[PDB]
Amino acid sequence: MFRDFDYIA
Amino acid sequence: KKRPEDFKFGKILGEGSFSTVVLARELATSREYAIKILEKRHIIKENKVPYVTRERDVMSRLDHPFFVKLYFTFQDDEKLYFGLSYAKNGELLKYIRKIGSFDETCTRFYTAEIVSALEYLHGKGIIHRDLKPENILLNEDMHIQITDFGTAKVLSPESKQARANSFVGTAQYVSPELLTEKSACKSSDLWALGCIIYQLVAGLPPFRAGNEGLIFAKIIKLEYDFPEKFFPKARDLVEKLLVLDATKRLGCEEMEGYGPLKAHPFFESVTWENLHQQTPPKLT
Ligand SMILES: Nc1ncnc2c1ncn2[C@@H]1O[C@H](COP(=O)(O)OP(=O)(O)OP(=O)(O)O)[C@@H](O)[C@H]1O
């Protein structure tokens, strides 16, 4: 999972 | 997309139950971040995935000077990483302990920053639910940086949701409605604000005991008292926040919001615009 975890402001 | 090898890690800044926060320098830019690192196996085993998702989702919505900023997240096979602004001066709680009691000027200034932050947060339909001095960090310039959003709640605008059902918080600052009605609302954070103002002046929060059940019993009975010399306008404000009926707390939606709160006499000398650009009073 954690597929929707990555993030960049 | 950032990667672990993009950073040089330095000292551990803190440890939580399922996380470690490390100071890091980004090699390409020389910027410093506080990077919160969680082990995937551990969070999966211990049912903490929703809290990690929540922290990311809530922080991604915030862009205000009185909140820790989430700049990026990334992952590798073993870990999750949150790149956060570094609050060099640590927790507000440290200063309450060091000094014992804040003077009126300092109480007013820091209370005003917290009120300004809550105005922003509530305007976005977000309830913090764990507001307390350990979760109010300080930056290099001694302005507040509110953190700890894994137990926060984004209320759905589509359903005009006002109440949230998860049982979260810290006993000393938990609202009576969460204890009795089993839900929290934006006004629950105003209860916590009252407790914090009391603590800044008195040195300890108002509902005190050696175990949680005893604290809960005091909260639901509004069983607390003020010490001597407690600044009279601050006392009046606390009495308007520590109200059992959540619809009667100064600043709540049913009391017509932040205007009346910011107009309280305790804040008469406050310039609410650009607080984050004002020099904070020295803590002494
Ligand atoms: N952005 C930051 N800048 C500086 N220090 C920080 C920052 N974020 C967290 N810390 C420090 O690291 C500590 C650990 O934070 P973390 O959010 O990992 O766990 P916690 O919330 O303290 O613990 P628990 O999850 O058990 O309640 C914090 O208590 C704080 O003192």
Q: Clarify whether residues B95 and B84 are in a common domain.
A: no
3-class SS at B64?
coil
- Cα–Cα distance measured from residue B193 to residue B113, given in angstroms and rounded to the nearest whole number: 11
Pick from B90, B121, B150: which residue ends a domain? B90
CB contact under 8 A, B56 and A2: no
Q: Cα torsion at B127, B129, B135, B140 (round to 10°)?
A: 10
Is the domain of B86 the same as that of B97?
A: no
Q: Please answer yes or no on whether B49 and A9 come within 8 Å at the CB atom.
A: no
Integer CA distances (angstroms), A1 to A6, B1, B45, B71, B166, in order: 11, 18, 13, 21, 23
Q: Quick one: B85 and B199 in the same domain?
A: no
Whether residue B71 sits in one domain with residue B154: no
Q: Are B176 and B220 in contact (CB under 8 A)?
A: yes
Domain boundary residue among B44, B67, B90?
Answer: B90
Rounded Cα distance between B53 and B222, Å, is 35
- What beta strand segments (E) does chain B contain? 7-15, 20-26, 32-39, 70-75, 79-84, 90-91, 126-127, 136-138, 144-146, 153-154
Is B18 one of the annotated binding-site residues? Answer: yes
CATH number where B57 lies: 3.30.200.20
Left if phi > 0, otherwise alpha if psi is -120 to 50, otherwise beta: which for B257?
left
Question: How many domains are there within chain B?
Answer: 2
CA-based angle B86:B147:B78, to the nearest 5? 75
Query: What separation in Å is there between the alpha carbon of B248 and the centre of ligand 1?
Result: 33
Q: Among residues B87, B53, B55, B52, which one has the least CA distance to residue B68?
A: B87
Structural domain containing residue B158 = 91-282
Q: Using only C-alpha atoms, what is the Rg of chain A?
A: 7
Resolution (A): 1.4
